[PDB]
């Protein structure tokens, strides 16, 4: 066996403890991945650190399922009901914001996103996140940094980021 196992890329050492990853099927030194032998006994399916990282980065790129869509509606609604969300519920009214459309070339708001969710416009989570981020970035670009509008965007985005944790 000439194969180099684990992240440390070394030959099999019969005297050392290894745990196998069910995702990539490689073998890892317990110590290299932070797994203790006594601990391994309590573990059923095991996923190594690298595979786990790839799966985490993967979440925003995989196809959205029907269950995912139920989550998107839930997230959207929690945002629409938030106290700092009032400035972003509907498209900006020109009469309320001088030259708004002359400053913001890609407007976005929660109502538009709700309609997009309804007609299954999003195919990957990254697209949903992009539209949401657009709302906050537009606000921060149009309004001054000491404006309560600017602060509403800061608060809602922080709220949104937490709400999305463990989504998929």
């Amino acid at each position: 066996d000439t194969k180099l196992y684990c992240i440390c890329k070394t030959p099999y050492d019969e005297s050392k403890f290894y745990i196998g990853c069910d995702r990539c099927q490689n073998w890892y030194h317990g110590r290299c991945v932070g797994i203790l032998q006594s601990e391994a006994e309590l573990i059923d399916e095991y996923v190594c650190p690298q595979c786990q990282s790839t799966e985490d980065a993967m979440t925003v790129l995989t196809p959205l399922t029907e269950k995912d869509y139920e989550g998107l509606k839930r997230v959207l609604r929690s945002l629409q009901a938030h106290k700092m969300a009032w400035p972003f519920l509907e498209p900006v009214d020109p009469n309320d914001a001088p030259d708004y459309y002359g400053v913001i070339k890609e407007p976005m708001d929660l109502a538009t996103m709700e309609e997009r969710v309804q007609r299954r416009y999003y195919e990957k989570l990254t697209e949903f996140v992009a539209d949401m981020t657009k709302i906050f970035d537009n606000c921060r670009y149009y309004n001054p940094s000491d404006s309560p509008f600017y602060q509403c965007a800061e608060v809602l985005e922080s709220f949104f980021v937490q709400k999305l944790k463990g989504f998929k």
Binding site: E14, K16, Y18, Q37, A40
Partner: peptide, 6 residues
């Protein structure tokens, strides 16, 4: 979990 011992 699958493992290899000493």
């Amino acid at each position: 979990a699958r493992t290899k011992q000493t």
